[PDB]
Amino acid sequence: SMNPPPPETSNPNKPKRQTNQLQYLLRVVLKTLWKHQFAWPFQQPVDAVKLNLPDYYKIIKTPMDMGTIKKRLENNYYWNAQECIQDFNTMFTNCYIYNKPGDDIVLMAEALEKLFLQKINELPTEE
Ligand SMILES: CNC(=O)c1ccc(-n2nc(Cn3cccn3)nc2-c2cn(C)c(=O)c3ccccc23)cc1
């Protein structure tokens, strides 16, 4: 079995900025979710080899995880907040697509997503 290459966290061809909204996404949003008791399945790319999920990357064609997001924020990969928000939403959606309703992992994603929505609700206005 083989994992795909992880999502890009570095790309000199891609435009980027440092902004207060992206700062908030790191300092408030990412940090809040990262420390949660249920964060651990979402802190790195799904290792379909070690986890014995050979169909994972047949079903999930746009993988995303908070490890990748954390790196993208820290390494200034993004142009705007929407790109980062999209990554979070992709991660949650992937979880719900792959896993069965009522699985623990779905409940775990839900707990993180609740907090995500609470924090994004107060995304600051652009400076
Ligand atoms: C973003 N990541 C995922 O989407 C993900 C990651 C791991 C798992 N795998 N892989 C195993 C190992 N295995 C293979 C065959 C039998 N067992 N078991 C789980 C797992 C299943 N279920 C129902 C859960 O609720 C759950 C909650 C937290 C962590 C793992 C799980 C499922 C989804």
Author numbering: 42 to 168
Text from the published report:
To provide proof-of-concept, we have applied this bottom-up approach to identify compounds targeting the first repeat of the Bromodomain and Extra-Terminal domain 4, BRD4 (BD1), whose role in cell proliferation, apoptosis, and transcription has made it a very appealing target. To address this challenge, we have conceived an innovative strategy that explores the chemical universe from the bottom up, performing a systematic search on the fragment space (exploration phase), to then mine the most promising areas of on-demand collections (exploitation phase). A basic implementation of the concept has enabled us to validate the strategy prospectively, allowing the identification of new BRD4 (BD1) binders with potencies comparable to stablished drug candidates. MDMix simulations of BRD4 (BD1) resulted in the identification of a polar interaction with the Nδ atom of Asn140 and a hydrophobic hotspot in the vicinity of a cluster of water molecules at the bottom of the BRD4 (BD1) binding site.
Second, we also sought to screen and experimentally confirm the predicted binding mode of the selected ligands by X-ray crystallography. To obtain additional validation of our bottom-up approach, we also screened the 85 compounds purchased via X-ray crystallography. These could provide additional positive compounds and an additional layer of validation of the binding modes proposed at the docking stage. We were able to obtain compounds 50, 92, and 94 bound to of BRD4 (BD1). X-ray diffraction pattern analysis revealed that compounds 92 (IC50 = 621.8 nM) and 94 (IC50 = 27.9 nM) bound with the expected binding mode based on the docking calculations. None of these compounds were considered DSF/SPR positive hits. Nonetheless, the corresponding IC50 values were obtained by TR-FRET.
